[PDB]
Each structure stands twice: as structure tokens, then as C-alpha cells.
Design a protein around this ligand. Structure first.
Ligand SMILES: N[C@@H](CCCNC(=O)CP(=O)(O)O)C(=O)O
Ligand SMILES: N[C@@H](CCCNC(=O)CP(=O)(O)O)C(=O)O
Ligand SMILES: N[C@@H](CCCNC(=O)CP(=O)(O)O)C(=O)O
Ligand SMILES: N[C@@H](CCCNC(=O)CP(=O)(O)O)C(=O)O
Ligand SMILES: N[C@@H](CCCNC(=O)CP(=O)(O)O)C(=O)O
Ligand SMILES: N[C@@H](CCCNC(=O)CP(=O)(O)O)C(=O)O
Ligand code: NI
Ligand code: NI
Lengths: 317, 317, 317, 317, 317, 317
């Protein structure tokens, strides 16, 4: 083709993900030392958000500035579909910016945008997956690799609801050959189709996956990860409804961390509902890496933007 | 004076419009070859939008980045008029940005902004005209000039409603000495005052204009252009109402294109209502140049911004 | 510490404020001569607005571009507090931008943001004070210093309501050793706590302050300053209610200016309600400096941003 | 291969030379309008001079600065050949600069440098030819094209000694399909091998060439070109010796220009020996373009450097 | 005209020299604070040296880099005059660099270069004067202004030979309205024509000048300045010859400084012959400012280059 | 202190040398990928050469351009010492450039320059040592580390004369904990004082050193290094004299390489005298890394310049 998209890590090999991590960490280190590599000079990113965002939006906008380009915030309601067709919007934006991202209510919207645009398209989260979160989370696990452990020998346990972030964490950990668990209650577990995709990743990678409601599954976790309980932006569970499903068994508290292990690190994509999926004590505690993880939303987005723009330039000399 | 505005092409000569085209195409060619001329370094554009926009807004914001400056999106509701007077807003913005554009509900708002501001002001569309569309459309017609034809010998036919874009296309084609037709139904034709202005342009240019409901008027068109049927943002015609006025006589379909001529190119400012003013077959067909035309919204805005900033610097050494 | 904030000028000495003025005016002069000092290259400012703004918002966004960085407009409703705690938002933004500003409904919000963020935080106005307005106003008074007068011998009279801008003007004038008066009606005067803070400033500076409803207080003013009468954004006084309190005694009209003195300059933070706190004749008259003052919102913000980023870099080598 | 050299225009087609002219003139026009295209950013040119130079050396050094790179002056005596072999010098410099030029006493030296270096090598003049002079001279003739004439219908007459510049002018004019004459005395005419190469160029181009001692050959010249009479830097003819050969028949004086034609333009590569090959009256006269021609040494070198670096980057992605 | 030269300060007013000082010191302060104003971006300076130089040459070359341009070192022997006429060299260089300087054996050479070039020409020292030294020395005296003294009330005494630097110091001090003395032995004093020029400066400035062999003339000097005794580069006095003329009466030693005054500062253009015109004790002593003075060769050259390029751009829009 | 010099690696620890290698290789990799880190923006390097140079001079000049600064070539004969004292030259240059290097005839000259200058001074080779060669050579050995070997287990054998490069190679290899041999004839071996310094390095590093005329010493070398036989620039041995001392025993030929080992790499600082210290077959052969080594003169100089400028900025905030 003449471009590459980042809609799902399912289209990336382990080697490509490692390259993305390595590129991201090199850029991070330069900036830490006071030097900003101008790798996207005069390039323009269209940023389409159908939902609210702090970390994803600010990461894209900051990343562009840091690398010498600019991000344009197209707020909820440039509509995807509607009166103007997605084919028209996609072809028009392909002439007016160099690269696109979109956070979408429905996954088909990002797929359609990628299919119809002739410039790189990045999924900034859908109801299905969250691939920039995957890369940031991988950067974070690499930086916080336990002493004497290979990445592939790490155990990553996601606690709670089968969110798009849960699935995405499963996708990236299995892609990298790691050991993944979704610890969640029946009715809120990764589904058969999700699990088939995790198995497919493991066939190649030698990693493992388990989906279970067994509380002992947290034992030996190197990373213990959670997310909110209220579901999707269009149809939230109420406090009473979600507490009924998840509390207290799926609350990440100090007792759960102690059971997972003394050096187990706590992760959360954020925003967090303190007192539901995680207690103040854990998220603010010595083993929380969620703020390093949030920083790495920017770390990973810088590397990804550069990778995709380099690919585009290679295909369009 | 100490600045120049771009409110209407009525204040520009043919020679100035050619200069704007030539400048725009030089910048376009540089960028096509991977080089971004930093002609607006550290300059700031205030972008006031009273209505939704994809092409105009993204073109301004991208243009500024590409040329080394920045565009600020001032969303619907910095009010023009209201509690704070237009004189105050204009004088204040003149101290805080280098150049302004505004897409306005009512033409007097852009006129007032231009009259009261001491920096260049650009009309990003009003209920009266659409002069940046004119320049982009002219760039497009120049690029797609038929073999063996001079620009002045081209025939440009606008089909349908007497929109501000219809009038603007009349203004630019007549300014350049071309042959213009508005093919539209009685009651929805360019009015007496519009036509007097077209005649005035032709007195100088030697071009021609005709406003007619004769379907044979499309015959021999080099460019066949249309726009939506629903009218102005504040007071849309319903689907039933606009179909009653315009359908099927004013639908640009393959039969109309065949009648216009085999090499006639289709143009539309966009967004398009597929199945009303144009069929899928035409807009997606081999003779459609509307996506090149959309790209040239950015092409023309880059040249215009540079022209106006150069003029400002010449007057304010 | 590892950063410095700009929440109130109460934490700045006279010498520091002079340094800020001098830095701001040097940058202004360079730009006047066509040279843009790239003092914030690749730096990112998060701009959180809980209320509407023309001058503050555009000043921050333009300042960043002029100095080689970028400002991100985070529109009303990234919430401060709410579902996601202020501690979380603050720590997250500290990883994703280099510097923050916020215009807040309630002062505690900016205090909390500053306390929880590890990057510099700037108050873009609260219900308590308006410190960037202070610096811009000081730059303006320095530029318009009366012939043969020291800054400290100037008399600055604020007319009307005890707005946050009124208090801020009191804070800066007393900090610089000048003579301040709030001329306002009983019930709408700077309160006991405000006045205690002004007295504290004067203990150090040798300046003076008076809060009074005596109309003779305007006599001998070098600067006569006013603001709107309708109160705070969340709870406005109606036209009838505010006219009943303030009109005509507190209307700045030509007669009041004549009484203050022939060379007294008129100031207003803007937006102004013409016909209430000021007449057209005064604000558009020969002794009005409110548009120079508005320009100096940008002048002062450039200097402040550079000062705070330099401080940050000094503390984080 | 992995690079391209500019040792002789014999390896360039007419289309490539036109491209070089067009690129050079676009860059010239940008700079005339105050804009410097940064097309060689951070690139380093090694400049090896075995002989003195004003125009060639300054053109290369200025060109690099203008385009965002740098030229290094390697003065007579980094030796080519000698104790360190040319193979070693060439391979070493290929690691330490991006592009090379050399003005050489003997043509084999530039050939050897080009053959052994893996970066582009440019001939800055040898005893055989002078290809950057060719391109500058072509740019000059294009700019000064007579009214109503095609380039190919122009007549270019070189007067005097069969210098490397004489031969080079023959090479470029015949490559472009023009009509060339060397008007020179027997014993000092382009030799049989030179003429065979001119005939070979004309076989492709349809141009013409003549080598003659007939004074009537100047009649109808559009460009009349000359050079010094003293021969090569290592073995100059004395004043008496060269006057005996060339004077007065080959002196370009006003009478010769009048005979050539009223609009014939005078060219000289410079430095000129006033009173020998040209009189003060001609070189300082209204029809002299030698200073425009000297400027175009820089014009052409900018275009060439960019062309060769672009070619290198295309071959080494 | 279309440019301005800097051949002698005789063509500059006191106000222009103050502007040059002020500009130079602003640039110096920026660089001291770590910021390099890019005021000469992509501009090229030709640097012609007929004599050796450390301070002048390095100052020009460094200044260009610091301000975003480049200086080209044209070493002794691009000849001025000779085989190629000065008119030709001047016109050719005017096409190939933006600005020129030259250090020349004979003053007429710099005059001829300035007269024939259409770009700014700067005198880098001749046998007559040294105007960049003047500006650097003035910057130095301003920075080291004695407490409680105006510039005009300062006494500047040059000791020793009537060098071009001696005369230049007389020219600048008298231009600025200061009090100048040349303390030198009969036969080696500023001549009648020099003194007539100093008187002419004083007619305008109200300054004073004296040329004398009275040793009491050093008393009350604020600045005591000297230079070498060996004369001009082409015809040096031997050690014995110059000692016979000048030693010990004109040796600046600690006794002379004590007599001049406790706060008198020692200046020397450098290079110095330690043990002749100055002792180690003085030049390395607490009251020596010659290294600050040497730094200000660069300070002044930066300001001058910018001033002349700005003037050129103003005249050639 | 307020700066750091690079006169000898004797003042650097193993950890510092590793840091220098790592920094150099990061910069090299960026440039290989088409990105030039602007780490020395607007910085000026004075380059003083008392002897001829290709690799050192071009490396410094190119390095400065690549990193956004500039190098000034001060050719043989700004004299160090002489009429103007070294103290004066050093103090003057400290005001006029940011960093200095010098290639000197006598080591005391670089020591004096470093001691008297207040800016970083780099030794570009003396009669004693060659520390930039050390760093380039170390970068080269790291890049060409044999499979399955640690740097410290490598054997490096220098063949021939006890040149400054021989000693320097001993210094760096022993500093890094490697195993060094000088294989050279009696009378031309590293002397007692050299060897005492190598022993001192080994006391810390655990490396080894041997100085011997035993031809079996080459056996097991991982790197086999040589240099010219003619001695120092001021007093060369003739061909007959040096052949008498060194030939054929110390000629690096294919037989010697075969004896050293099949994967032993050949190194030479260059220029090489082919047919003396090395045969064509070896230097042009598959195991020669001398051109990679020459490239790494630039690799190492980039890292060193950045390291020293960063150190300077840290000490002079
Ligand atoms: N399951 C959650 C996932 C939120 C991911 N968070 C982020 O990407 C951080 P942001 O929203 O601040 O960009 C949901 O559906 O809302
Ligand atoms: N008659 C139409 C004109 C739309 C012009 N379109 C554009 O300028 C493209 P945009 O809206 O995406 O900027 C109307 O009044 O709506
Ligand atoms: N008392 C007024 C203060 C307005 C200050 N104005 C500004 O800062 C100018 P802006 O709102 O355009 O940024 C109020 O509470 O509204
Ligand atoms: N036949 C002459 C050619 C000189 C060409 N001149 C130039 O290239 C101008 P320059 O020497 O100033 O670079 C000779 O052999 O000397
Ligand atoms: N009278 C002395 C003047 C030297 C001025 N010195 C300088 O300009 C310093 P520089 O030579 O290092 O540039 C002479 O004729 O030599
Ligand atoms: N022993 C040799 C060392 C030469 C080192 N070579 C280099 O540094 C390469 P260069 O001279 O090209 O910079 C001698 O004394 O000459
Ligand atoms: Ni922006
Ligand atoms: Ni240079």
C-alpha cells in the first residue's frame, strides 16, 4: 500500500512492537536530557474526538509540538458519517492533514476512516480496543521490568470488567509472549471471540492467557492492572449496579496487592474511580506506576507518530 | 492604508488574482517536493467560526503550521457584536494576533471586523460570498485547464441554487474573463444586483455571464459546478421542499455530464448531499475534480495568507 | 522547591515584579522590531478555561507561538475536581505539558492545581484575584508614566465594584509602592481582609491605600481604572440592580476624567459595558489607554511564561 | 549506482540540464524575494582548490550557507595523490563530508576523486572543462533570451583561445541544441577530439558547431563570449607572446560587438584582462552581461548541489 | 543610496554611534543569558584579510555564526587590485555575498571597495583608521563608566605612537563629546590633518582634544590607552629604534597608572608587546580592562553587522 | 573549576569514556537515520592547526555544522607563543569562541592553552598523545567487538614505532581494562615513563600491557594497529633510515594478519605509507576497518564536543 494504519496491534508483529518501544524510549531519553528531536517538522495531525479525553488528547497535541508539528483538535460534533459520508470526509481530510487520529464511539468508524483515508489513521480508543494504550503500557512494563526477569516471563493480571482496555492489554501481552490473566466475574469476562484472538497471539508468541473468576489468579502477578466498572460512555452502569457486580471481590486494595506480591506494580489507564476498582492506598502507594504509565501515553504516541510518518514517506518518495 | 483585507474579490484585479494563483501553486509545488517554505514564521491567525466547517477550518489551521505560524480556533460562541462591541473586539484582536479570519452568519459582521481591525481580515464565508473558495476554485481550473484552451475561453456552469458559492463562482470567473452561467430555476437565480456586479466585472474582463433555467445551457461546459439545495444554516429548506424546487432538473447526473461534454469536469464546494444535487456516479466518477478542489482550499489559503502578511509588512516597516 | 507558581503576586517581591516588567518589555521591543525570541521552543502550555475569555486566552495562545512553543485550549468542561480527583488531574497533566494555566470559577481550584502539580501553574483569573492582569497593567503604567513622576508617586484610582480586578490592582500598586484608591459605594468596597493585605504590602513598600465612597478621591489620579458592574459569572446583577447600586456616581464619564486631571489616563480590563461603568466618549477618547493595556496582556504573559520556565529549568537541571 | 557526479555535462541529457536550470532559477527567485530555501540543512561540502578562485569558491561557500549547510575550504596544499593515495583520500573524505568539489590542475584528478568517492563529486574546473560554468552560463542565456527567439535558434560565438571554458561553452550550447562557433586563430582552435564531441552532441540535439578563423563568424551572434589569452595556470604565455597570437583580431571591442549585432550580449567567465581579450568599453557597456553571469555561478551551484544531494538521498534511503 | 558602509565613523553622528552601542549591548546581554538572536539568518560575509589578525577575524567569523549567518575567510593573497581590477572584484563580490569586510594595507583599498561595491563594506583596519575598534572601545568605556560621571566628562589619554588606533580613539571620543589626549613624543604625534578632524568633531560635540609630549597630561585620565611602538606591518621599527624613541617615557607602568588615578582603567587594542608600551604588572593588573575590551570587538561587530544589514534591507525592499 | 579540557584521557575514568562512546554512538545512529541533533546550536569552535590534517580538521569542521554550530579554521601561522604571549592569546580566544582545539608541534603548547583558557580546550594531537584518536578508536573497537567477547578480554597489538598514537592506544586500551601490546624494535619502543603510565592504568582497570620485540606477540590479537615509520613532522626519518629500522619485521602484511588470527581486524590512524608499515593487500582487505575507524574520528569528535559544552553549561548557569 501507500500508508500504514494503527487501528489494532493485531496487524503488528512482536518485532515491530519492540521497534516502536525502542524508538519511543530513545525520543523520551533525548527530551529528558533537554533535546527535542524535530522528527515531524511542519506536519499536521487531525485529532477527532467523539468522547472526552485528558491523556490521549493532550498526549497527541503535546507530541506534535515536541516533534516540530501541530495537532488540530476537532471537537465532538466534524461528524464521522451523517450528512457527509465517511468516504467524503476521509478523502477530504487526506488532502488537508498528514496524519489522523480518532477516538470513536463505535469501532467501525475508525475502521472506515482508515479504509477510506490515504494517510495514516490512528485509533485513539473505540468500544473494541485501545492500541495506543497498549504501546504506552508496554513501554511502562519494559521500564519497570522486575530484576532478573525477562519480559516474556512476566505475569500481567487485569482485574474487573472486560473493558476495551482489558482486551487490549491481553492483545499486547500475548503479542509480546507474556502471561496474561483476566480476573473478572462471570458475565463480565473477555468473551469467546476475544479469547480466540488471544490464543492466536500465543500460537506465535509462546505466551499464555487465562480468563477466570478465581481470586487466586492474582498470585505472582508482576503487574496488576484495572479500569473503571461503569462500562461504555453511551450506556453506563449506575453506582449501585456496578458495585453489585464487582464489589468487593474485584476491588484492588492493599490486601490484593500483598497477595499478588510485594514487588507487584499497580497499573490503571485512568481516570480511576477511587473507592471502586482501586483504593486510595494502592493508587497513591509505593507500588503504583499509573502516573509513569500516564506519562508513557505521550512516550508511545511520539514514537508511533514518527514510525507512521516515516513509513508514509518511504512509500511516497 | 496600513493593511489589506480579503472580504471580496471585487477589490482585486485580474492581475492580483493571477499573482495569488501563481504564489499558491509555487508553495504547493515546494510542499509536494517535501519542502515547507517558512513564510509565516511565528505569526498568529485568529480563526473565528460562527458555523461548522471541515475544509475552511482545517485549511487555515494546517496552512499556518506548514508556513511556520499557528492558527487559533475560536469556536462558535468570542462573539462578534453582543455585549462587547465589534469595535472593541476588533481593536483588541488587532493587538493579540497578526491576521484574522471569520466565517460569519451575516456578511455585515465580516465587513465590520475588517473595517475596525488594523490587521488583515479574511472572509471565511458569509451569506453573501465565499472568496477563499473562489481562489481555490480558480487554482483548480488553472490546474485542470482543457488542452488547447485559454482560461478565458472556458465555460463554467453552476447548477442549482443561487448560493453564496454560486455568486462567488460568478465573481471569480467573470473577473478572470471567463464565460459563466448560472443554470437555476426561477425564484432561485442570481438576482438583479448579483447580475449587475457580474456585468461590471465583464465590462473590464471581456468575459460573459448568463442566468437561465434553460437546460441546454450546460452544453459545452468545461467545468460544471454545484452546491447543496437546503439554503442557509439558519433557515434550511426541508428535503421535501428542496426536492420540489430542484429535482430532477437540477440534479447533476451522468446524463447531464454527457450533455455538457466528455471532458467536462465536475466541481462541488462540499459537503455534498449525494442523491440530491449530484449522484454518487458523478462525484466518484472519472471526471470529478472535487477532491483536488478541496485540496486547493488549502493551496489557496497558503498563498493568500502569505500575500496579505507580505502586504502588511510592506506597509508597516 | 522544584518549580514556582503564579497564583498571586503576594508571593512576589517588588524587585521580582520589576524584573518581570523589564523582561516583558525587552521581548515586546524585539517583536516590535520584527524579531521573535524563541525562548519557549517546543514547550507546551495546557490552557484550562472554566469561563469565556478573549484577551487572556488569545494572549496565552499567541505568546506560546511567538516564543516557539504551543498552547493547548482545554475548553470549559477537562474538569477540575469531579469524578477524577484534582490530585490525579494535576499529576497527570504534570507529565503531559510543561506549564499550566487555568481560569477558574473558584480560587481554591487554582490553589489546588498549583499545590498538586509539579510544573508551574498560572492563575488566569479567579473570583479572588487576577495576577496576569496585574502584570499587564503594571507594564502599561510604566510605559505611560507621567512626565517628571516616579512610579511610586503615581495615584491609581479604581472606580466601582470590588471586583477581583479591583483587588488585584490594589495588590500590584501597593506592592510597587504606589498610591491606590478604591472609590466604591458602601456594600461594594474592598473588604476588611482585602484592606489588611493592602496594608501589609504598604508596610514594606511605603505606598498607600484608601477605600472610600468620597467622589473627591478621583482628584489627582494619574490612572483611573474601572470594570463591569454585574459581578461574577455564576451570579450576575441585572441591569436594573447594578444601575441602582452604581449609576451615575460611579460612571466614568468625561466630567470625572476632567476632575481627576487633564493627563489622567483611563484603564479598563475589558470587556466594558459602554454606558454603564464608562461612556463611549471616555473609552474612545484621547486619554484612554485600554487598548494598549489589552495589548499588554500579551506583553506580560510572554515575560511571565519565560520567567517561570527559566525558573523550572534552573531547579531541574 | 549509489551517487551521481558532475564531472562533465557529457553525462547529462538536455532534459536534465533544463531541470537544473529550472531548479536553479526557482531557488534564485525565492532568495530574491527574501526567502532562503533550507534544502541542504546540516550538509557539509568539502571544497578542494588547487588553484586560486573568486567566483567558484565564493559561490560554493555562499551556496551552502544560503541552503542551510556549510562549505569547508581546503586550501591549495589536502593533496590529491602524493604520499597518501587518491583512493585513501577519497574513501576518507566520503566518511567525513556529504559532497565534494575540487578545482584541479589536471583533469584525471577530478575523475579519480569521482571514481573513488562514494559521495557526489563536482568538478570546479580542470584543464579539460568547466561544467559549473556551463550551467551558470546556460542560466544566464535563458534569462537573457532575445525577444522572439527560442534557445535553440541562438548563436553563441566564443572568441580567442581554445580554453577549457571555450570547450565547455561548446559542450553546453550543443547539448541544448543551439548554434556554437569557436572563432580562434589556427593553432589555438578546439582540436579534432573536441570537435568530434561537439558533433556527437549535435547528432542528438540538432544544434550546430563551427571552428574557424573567419572574422565574419561573429555576425548574427546573440551571445559573444571570451576568456583570457595567457593559457593554463602552470604555463602562462607572456604578454608579448599572447598579444602576438591574438591581438588585435581576437580583441572583443565595440566594433566587433557592432558587427555581431546591436542586441548581442557580451559574456566572459572572468577574471578578464582588460585591454587584451576585451576592451573596457565593451565589458562595462550596456550589452555586457558578465556580472549577471558571475552572479549565476552562485545561481547554478545552488541548483546543482540540491540536485546531487536529492539524487544521493533517493539512492540511499 | 542603496546601502551604507562603515569605512570611518566620520560619516556617523553621535546619535548613530549611541544606537550602535545600545544595539550591541542588547545582543550581548541576550547571549549572556543563553539566547542567540538570529538576526543575520542565511547571510554571508566575505572577509578579506591582507594582514594577520586574531581579534578582528575571529570576531567577524564568530559574530556571523552567533547571528545565524556565516563568514568566509578570504586569506591574504582574492587580491584587491592587481590583474583583476578593483571595480571587477567589487561588482563580482556584490553578487556573491551580502556584506564585506576587509583589513587592508592601504586605506584607498577599502575606500575603493566601498565605492565600487553595491553591498555594505566594513573597514577591518587600514593604515589610516580602525572604526570597528572605535565601536568596541566605546562599548567598553560605556560599560566601565566611572561612578558619578557622564560619558562626556571622561578623559581618555592615548600614550605613545600616532597609530591608526590612536587616531581612531581620537575620532570616537571627540565624536561622543569626550575629552581626548594624545600623549606622544614630537615626530610621532597625531599630525595637523588629524588634529583638524578632531577639532571638527569637537565643534559639533563640545568635546576636547590635546596632542602633547607633557607627561602631566595623563593626570585625571579615566581611561589610559596604548598600542605597539613598531609602526606599520610593511615597515616596522626595530626594537632598538622604537625603544630609542619611546622608552621609558611612554611606557605605561604602575607609576603612570598611579599618576593618572587610582580608578583609571588601562586599555590596549592588542596584541601587546609586554615590556615595551605596557608592563606585565599593568596589563595583568586589577585596573586592566583590555580583555573586556577584546571581548567587545565581538560585541560591537555583532551590532554593526545587524545595523548595516537592516539598513540594506530598508533600502532594498 | 568552571570548565573541563580534553588534553589527555589520563584525566578521564573508564565510566566517563564509556559515556563518551555511548553519546557518540547515539548521535551517529540519529544521523544515520537522517536526523541531525542540534546540540551545539550557534556555538563556535576555534581550530588551531600547527600541522597538516585531513581527518582531524574535517571531523571538527563537519561535526560543528552537523550539530548546529561552526568551526573556524585558524591555519598554521594565530601563533601560540611568540610575540603575543600564550596567556594573552588564551584569554582573548576565551572571549571570542566557545570551545578550542589545537594540533600542536609540542605538547606544552596544548597544556598552556588549556591552563590559560577559561573555555574547554581539546588536544587535536601533539608529540606526546592523540586523545581524540583514542576515543574514535574505542568507538571502532566497540562497534567491531568480536562475537562472544567482552571488550576487556580483547587483545590490541600496536606494531612498529612508539608514535604518539601508539602511546595513546596504550592509554585507552589500558584505561578500558583491555590487553595491550606494543610490538616494536628496541630503541623505538614505548619508554619507561610511558610504561609506568600504562601500569598505573592497569592497577585500576585490571587490564594488561606488554612492550616487546617478540614477533609471536601478534598471535591472538583481536585488533592489529599500525602507524607510519618516519617519526615527527619536524624531523622525519628518511625512507632508507626507517626501512633499516623496521622492514620487514614490522610490516603488517597478510602473513602477519594470518598469524594474529583469521578474524583479527586491521587498524591504522592514517595517512598510511603503503608498502612500508602496511601492504595494499591488508589495508584494502576484508579485515581492514581503517575507513570505519576514520569515520569514527567524526563520530567521537561529535560526542566529545557535546560532552564538553554540556559540562561548561552545567558549571556556568
Ligand atoms: N474503559 C475506559 C477506558 C478509558 C481509557 N483511558 C484513557 O485513554 C485516558 P483519557 O480518556 O484521559 O484519554 C472507558 O471506556 O472509558
Ligand atoms: N452554500 C453552502 C456553501 C458551503 C461551502 N463549503 C465550504 O466552505 C467547505 P466547509 O464548510 O467544510 O469549510 C452553505 O451555505 O453551507
Ligand atoms: N470582573 C470581571 C473581570 C474581567 C477581566 N477581563 C479579562 O481578563 C479579559 P478576558 O475575559 O477577555 O480574558 C469579571 O469577573 O468578569
Ligand atoms: N581559462 C581560464 C578560465 C577561468 C574560469 N573562471 C572562473 O571559474 C572564475 P574563478 O577563477 O574566480 O572561480 C583559466 O584557465 O584560468
Ligand atoms: N597599530 C596596530 C593596531 C592593531 C589593532 N589590533 C587589532 O585589530 C587586533 P587583531 O590584529 O588581533 O585583529 C597595528 O597597526 O598593527
Ligand atoms: N604518528 C603520526 C600520527 C598521525 C595521526 N593521524 C591523524 O590524526 C589523521 P590526520 O592527520 O588526517 O588528522 C604523526 O605523527 O603524523
Ligand atoms: Ni494549536
Ligand atoms: Ni566556515
Amino acid at each position: 500500500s501507500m500508508k500504514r494504519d494503527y487501528v489494532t496491534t493485531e496487524t503488528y508483529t512482536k518485532e515491530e512492537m519492540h521497534y516502536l518501544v525502542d524508538l519511543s524510549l530513545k525520543i523520551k531519553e533525548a527530551i529528558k536530557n533537554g533535546y527535542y528531536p524535530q522528527l515531524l517538522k511542519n506536519k499536521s495531525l487531525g485529532m477527532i474526538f467523539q468522547q472526552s479525553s485528558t491523556r490521549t488528547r493532550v498526549s497527541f497535541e503535546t507530541a506534535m509540538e515536541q516533534l516540530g508539528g501541530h495537532g488540530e483538535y476537532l471537537a465532538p460534533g466534524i461528524q464521522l458519517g451523517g450528512h457527509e459520508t465517511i468516504e467524503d470526509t476521509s478523502r477530504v481530510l487526506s488532502r488537508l492533514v498528514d496524519i489522523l487520529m480518532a477516538r470513536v464511539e463505535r469501532h467501525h468508524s475508525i475502521v472506515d476512516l482508515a479504509n477510506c483515508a490515504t494517510i495514516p489513521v490512528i485509533n485513539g480508543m473505540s468500544d473494541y480496543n485501545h492500541p495506543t494504550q497498549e504501546l504506552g503500557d508496554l513501554c511502562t512494563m519494559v521500564e519497570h521490568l522486575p530484576e532478573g526477569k525477562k519480559l516474556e516471563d512476566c505475569k500481567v493480571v487485569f482485574v474487573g470488567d472486560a473493558t476495551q482496555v482489558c482486551f487490549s492489554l491481553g492483545l499486547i501481552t500475548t503479542k509480546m509472549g507474556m502471561n496474561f490473566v483476566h480476573f473478572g466475574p462471570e458475565g463480565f469476562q473477555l468473551n469467546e471471540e476475544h479469547q480466540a484472538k488471544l490464543a492466536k497471539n500465543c500460537e506465535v508468541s509462546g505466551g499464555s492467557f487465562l480468563v477466570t473468576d478465581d481470586a487466586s489468579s492474582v498470585e505472582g502477578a508482576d503487574f496488576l492492572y484495572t479500569d473503571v466498572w461503569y462500562g461504555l460512555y453511551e450506556a453506563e452502569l449506575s453506582e449501585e449496579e456496578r458495585m453489585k457486580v464487582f464489589y468487593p471481590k474485584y476491588q484492588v486494595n492493599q490486601e490484593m496487592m500483598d497477595r499478588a506480591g510485594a514487588n507487584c506494580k499497580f497499573m490503571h489507564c485512568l481516570p480511576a474511580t477511587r473507592g471502586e476498582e482501586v483504593t486510595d492506598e494502592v493508587i497513591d502507594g509505593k507500588n503504583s506506576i499509573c502516573f509513569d504509565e500516564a506519562e508513557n501515553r505521550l512516550t508511545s504516541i511520539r514514537g508511533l507518530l514518527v514510525y507512521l510518518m516515516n513509513d508514509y514517506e518511504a512509500k511516497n518518495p
